[PDB]
Amino acid sequence: AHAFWSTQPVPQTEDETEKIVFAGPMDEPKTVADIPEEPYPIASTFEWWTPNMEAADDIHAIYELLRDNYVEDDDSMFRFNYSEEFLQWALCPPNYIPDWHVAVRRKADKKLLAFIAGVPVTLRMGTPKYMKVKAQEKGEGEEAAKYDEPRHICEINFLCVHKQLREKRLAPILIKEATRRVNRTNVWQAVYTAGVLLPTPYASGQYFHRSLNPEKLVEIRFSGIPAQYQKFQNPMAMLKRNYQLPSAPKNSGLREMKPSDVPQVRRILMNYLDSFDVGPVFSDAEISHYLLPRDGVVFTYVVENDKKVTDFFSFYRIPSTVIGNSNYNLLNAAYVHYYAATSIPLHQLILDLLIVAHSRGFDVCNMVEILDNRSFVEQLKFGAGDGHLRYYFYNWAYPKIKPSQVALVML
Ligand SMILES: CCCCCCCCCCCCCC(=O)SCCNC(=O)CCNC(=O)[C@H](O)C(C)(C)COP(=O)(O)OP(=O)(O)OC[C@H]1O[C@@H](n2cnc3c(N)ncnc32)[C@H](O)[C@@H]1OP(=O)(O)O
Numbered sequence: 192a193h194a195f196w197s198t199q200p201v202p203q204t205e206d207e208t209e210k211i212v213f214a215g216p217m218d219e220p221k222t223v224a225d226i227p228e229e230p231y232p233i234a235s236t237f238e239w240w241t242p243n244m245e246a247a248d249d250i251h252a253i254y255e256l257l258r259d260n261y262v263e264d265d266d267s268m269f270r271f272n273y274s275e276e277f278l279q280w281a282l283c284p285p286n287y288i289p290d291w292h293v294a295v296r297r298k299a300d301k302k303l304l305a306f307i308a309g310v311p312v313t314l315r316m317g318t319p320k321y322m323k324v325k326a327q328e329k330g331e332g333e334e335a336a337k338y339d340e341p342r343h344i345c346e347i348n349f350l351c352v353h354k355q356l357r358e359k360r361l362a363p364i365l366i367k368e369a370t371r372r373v374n375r376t377n378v379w380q381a382v383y384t385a386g387v388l389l390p391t392p393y394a395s396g397q398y399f400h401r402s403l404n405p406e407k408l409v410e411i412r413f414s415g416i417p418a419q420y421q422k423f424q425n426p427m428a429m430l431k432r433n434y435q436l437p438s439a440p441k442n443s444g445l446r447e448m449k450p451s452d453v454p455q456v457r458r459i460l461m462n463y464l465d466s467f468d469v470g471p472v473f474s475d476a477e478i479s480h481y482l483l484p485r486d487g488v489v490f491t492y493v494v495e496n497d498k499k500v501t502d503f504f505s506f507y508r509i510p511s512t513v514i515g516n517s518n519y520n521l522l523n524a525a526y527v528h529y530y531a532a533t534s535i536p537l538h539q540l541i542l543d544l545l546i547v548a549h550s551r552g553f554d555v556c557n558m559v560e561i562l563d564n565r566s567f568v569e570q571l572k573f574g575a576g577d578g579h580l581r582y583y584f585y586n587w588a589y590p591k592i593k594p595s596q597v598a599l600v601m602l
């Protein structure tokens with residue numbers, strides 16, 4: 192029973208999605224001229240506001256809203272606390288559209304009540320490999336390949352309704368208004384992810400985490416000894432020994448990424464991502480934006496062997512407010528971003544990610560099982576978390592795929 196999602200151009204059930212064999216649009220074709228010029232109606236007490244996400248004070252306003260009202264874990268222990276610097280980075284990539292950053296404020300006092308954001312991305316989202324094999328068998332190759340060209344679409348993130356205004360049907364209004372503004376830019380698809388199940392994901396993956404500071408983690412999450420360590424005489428010493436890391440990177444030639452690295456990083460990353468059914472395509476400007484180091488935000492290291500970049504990894508920072516535990520304000524988490532390995536095993540490359548993160552004072556490394564992230568889970572002592580990340584498209588029929596066929600990292 193979905194009063195809003197039943198009206199939208201998405202597959203309505205798992206059963207429906209399991210039937211889809213080719214990529215393509217769901218809705219009637221439309222043009223920009225069909226789409227309302229006026230913002231979607233909202234109660235008189237409210238007003239639409241388009242923040243300027245390159246302006247410090249507007250960034251700070253959105254920052255506070257998310258700090259206090261964004262995504263929590265399921266047990267009221269953590270709330271994401273994306274930083275102001277991070278929001279500017281994530282929301283203002285090359286060729287971003289300011290109008291796609293959508294807020295609602297109370298008109299009387301200008302209190303910020305809600306937000307949703309779209310950003311442009313170029314995405315490969317053609318029929319997946321396994322369904323093209325089927326299509327070929329059935330003599331339907333061209334129909335399966337029709338939508339292979341990378342598509343200039345919208346990624347939606349940062350949907351947030353203030354906690355005081357929950358369960359008032361505000362979220363559907365925010366979605367409708369974002370949709371209208373994106374459609375008015377001649378864009379007709381979106382990709383989005385969520386921790387909740389909605390109609391209807393094309394892929395779903397567990398979260399995995401790797402403790403870097405177990406004494407802090409075990410104290411917050413338990414807030415004493417985890418069950419399987421209860422058998423040791425000295426559980427904390429065992430925990431610390433289990434998660435200990437080198438104090439400096441092992442790969443000779445590791446260094447932070449440089450602007451002159453951009454084109455080589457672009458080539459090795461694109462060659463790698465092209466192996467996945469769903470993944471982004473980045474220009475040099477986008478590689479520069481999403482991967483060059485930005486203090487407190489994104490950290491990227493390359494393996495350089497004789498002036499050649501042969502491998503790289505990146506991670507980004509999202510602290511979470513420790514909303515349950517009294518002893519700590521924040522948990523400093525490093526999330527695995529894009530990477531590519533051509534000279535060393537992936538586990539050896541990502542060991543250095545763990546070492547740098549640890550050395551820079553992060554408490555935990557988190558990721559979803561997209562890309563080849565499962566290839567280093569066991570070797571590097573990641574464990575499954577309680578979350579899942581579900582991947583969705585708006586106005587795009589798409590067959591179920593495995594999370595290891597997804598190459599899009601969402602921030
Ligand atoms: C071509 C361009 C298209 C662009 C748009 C593409 C689509 C983008 C879609 C958005 C992608 C966002 C990606 C992210 O940012 S996912 C992160 C979402 N944010 C949070 O979880 C932060 C904390 N929670 C909140 O702020 C609120 O609980 C939210 C805002 C989530 C719901 O507010 P509230 O709790 O006050 O409820 P309501 O009474 O207003 O509305 C209830 C309706 O909302 C449906 N609902 C609940 N949660 C989500 C959810 N995460 N995505 C989509 N729909 C959701 C729900 O099923 C129901 O519909 P229906 O079951 O009756 O049908």
Ligand SMILES: CC(C)Cc1ccc2ncccc2c1NS(=O)(=O)c1ccc(CCCCC2CCN(C)CC2)cc1
Nearest residue numbers: 263264269271384385386398400511576577578601602
């Ligand atoms: C406590 C650690 C061992 C792992 C950890 C660290 C920080 C967290 N902060 C907030 C929520 C959960 C945290 C967590 N536990 S977890 O199992 O790794 C996990 C559980 C739940 C989620 C949230 C649902 C995903 C929200 C999506 C995330 C991506 N975005 C583009 C749209 C919103 C994320 C991560």
